[PDB]
Design a protein around this ligand. Structure first.
Ligand SMILES: [Zn+2]
Ligand SMILES: [Zn+2]
Ligand SMILES: [Zn+2]
Ligand SMILES: [Zn+2]
Ligand SMILES: [Zn+2]
Ligand SMILES: [Zn+2]
Ligand SMILES: [Zn+2]
Lengths: 156, 158
């Protein structure tokens, strides 16, 4: 059973917020399954992506402090330069299905990302949770409308 | 680009018979299996058992003298006769096991769910797409059939 764990922390302008729980990443016969064990999130569907750089630190953009900016953009080994979701080979390999958050603010619903096949593809990248949702497109809003980076955890 | 795709209409399952139309689910073939994109409305917020049942019917059935909603659809699609409920990501259970149907706070269903084990529309035609009152933990424990419980909405895939 090739499975591993990722600690998730709140993402503040200053650094790291409280621990919001974990996410289990498991290899299946159909791809990587992300089983969340998170708490304290806004109910609804959240942008859920793997970002390039292994960091959840703040960065500077237009003079302001931006949560988890040091993580860079989306994991994109094919250099597609386009956000197209978990089921389309023509976009960022780091595109996972939206994270489903319950009414009590927890995340327990497992999401399969069929394109990822082994834990190695996930190591040394930032697992990102956004404020906004994800329609798996750059239209109408870029990167699925995720907007701000709200929670994060370096995988390794 | 291009990939085969079809549409299924969903109705309320009442003891009496069919209820309000709730919208549709688009089933599309993808490189990674069948994708079920819902366009539904008027559902209880939360996560709902979402399975394919054996018989091409959504009609009620009689069980001990009571009309049971969508009972005429039979049990879960299980060609390999596993006789067990293990979800969308496990080969050892019902082929008809899809991921839970995610319903928003407003009662709509819009979140696409991939079922990796289904590969083509032919595996899905002439079966019932079922929506339960309860959720789905992809297991027979601690409740049978993921804890889906009552059948609350249904649609026959042509
Ligand atoms: Zn992102
Ligand atoms: Zn992306
Ligand atoms: Zn075309
Ligand atoms: Zn069922
Ligand atoms: Zn089943
Ligand atoms: Zn069949
Ligand atoms: Zn048992």
């Amino acid at each position: 059973k090739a499975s591993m764990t990722v600690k998730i922390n709140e993402s503040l302008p200053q650094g790291n917020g409280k621990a919001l729980g974990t996410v289990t990443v498991t290899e299946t016969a159909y791809g990587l399954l992300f089983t969340p064990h998170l708490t304290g999130l806004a109910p609804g569907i959240h942008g859920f992506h793997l970002h390039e750089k292994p960091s959840c630190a703040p960065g500077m953009k237009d003079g302001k402090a931006v949560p988890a900016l040091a993580a860079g953009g989306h994991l994109d080994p094919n250099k597609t330069g386009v956000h197209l979701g978990p089921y389309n080979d023509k976009g960022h390999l780091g595109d996972l299905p939206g994270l489903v958050v319950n009414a009590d603010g927890t995340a327990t619903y497992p999401v399969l990302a069929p394109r990822l096949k082994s834990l190695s593809e996930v190591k040394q990248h930032a697992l990102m949770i956004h404020a906004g949702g994800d329609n798996y497109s750059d239209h109408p809003m870029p990167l699925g409308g995720g907007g701000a980076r709200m929670a994060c955890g370096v995988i390794e």
